[PDB]
């Protein structure tokens, strides 16, 4: 359950260490993102050698959440940290070459088929 002012750890290796959600996209008065929704990001902490510098506004996808993801069967998949993968605003597609940690099945929405191939689990 991600929203404005939610800080996120970054799953991919684009450069950013910690980011912050400045907006949830895809509708007016939209409260939350999660599961595999697009959000707008600002970079609050970045490594020196990364592709993206600090204080840069760009898009992202929420890959992991603490509140979790509900299945069709009634089961739920939670995690121990809110996490996202950074994207290239207009182009979309992931910036980083590789993704650390697991990512859920509900991310399988084509456009993100690049993201699932790189991820190690699920």
């Amino acid at each position: 359950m991600i929203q404005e002012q939610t800080m996120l750890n970054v799953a991919d290796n684009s450069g950013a260490r910690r980011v912050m959600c400045i907006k949830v996209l895809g509708g007016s008065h939209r409260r939350y993102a999660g599961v595999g929704d697009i959000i707008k990001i600002t970079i609050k902490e970045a490594i020196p050698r990364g592709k993206v510098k600090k204080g840069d506004v760009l898009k992202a996808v929420v890959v992991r959440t603490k509140k979790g993801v509900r299945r069709p069967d009634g089961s739920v998949i939670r995690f121990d940290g809110n996490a996202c993968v950074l994207l290239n605003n207009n182009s979309e597609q992931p910036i980083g070459t590789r993704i650390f940690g697991p990512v859920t099945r509900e991310l399988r929405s084509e456009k993100f088929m690049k993201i699932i191939s790189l991820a190690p689990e699920v």
């Binding site: 089961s75 939670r78 121990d80 996490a83 940690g101 190690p120 689990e121």
Partner: protein, 114 residues
């Protein structure tokens, strides 16, 4: 009521293996890649068990690559293929939510062996 209890008792799979909380369980799970039908593994420590008959469930915690994962399985679902037990923990609590705050050496648990 009897009308509900009759509807619950027919659906329940009558061969669930007994496991306690603190058991290192390996759940097999049916997953679907569009047309395919695979059996995923999910090995991890059982943190909580909810018994409500048909509505029963249990939380499996797995410290996978990177960060921890926590999966609630609906025991009587047809997605759950099988629930094998690897180890049995010598814990004396029903719910093991304190293991969320621990990691690595602190998070490990004593073995039952009785």
């Amino acid at each position: 009521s009897n009308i509900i209890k009759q509807l619950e008792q027919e659906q329940m799979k009558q061969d669930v293996p007994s496991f306690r909380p603190g058991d290192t369980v390996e759940v097999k799970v049916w997953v679907v890649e569009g047309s395919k039908k695979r059996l995923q593994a999910f090995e991890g420590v059982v943190i909580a068990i909810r018994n409500r008959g048909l509505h029963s469930a249990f939380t499996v915690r797995k410290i996978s690559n990177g960060e921890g994962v926590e999966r609630v399985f609906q025991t009587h679902s047809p997605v759950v293929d099988s629930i094998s037990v690897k180890r049995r923990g010598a814990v004396r609590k029903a719910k093991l939510y304190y293991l969320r705050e621990r990691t690595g050496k602190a998070a490990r648990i004593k073995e039952r062996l009785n």
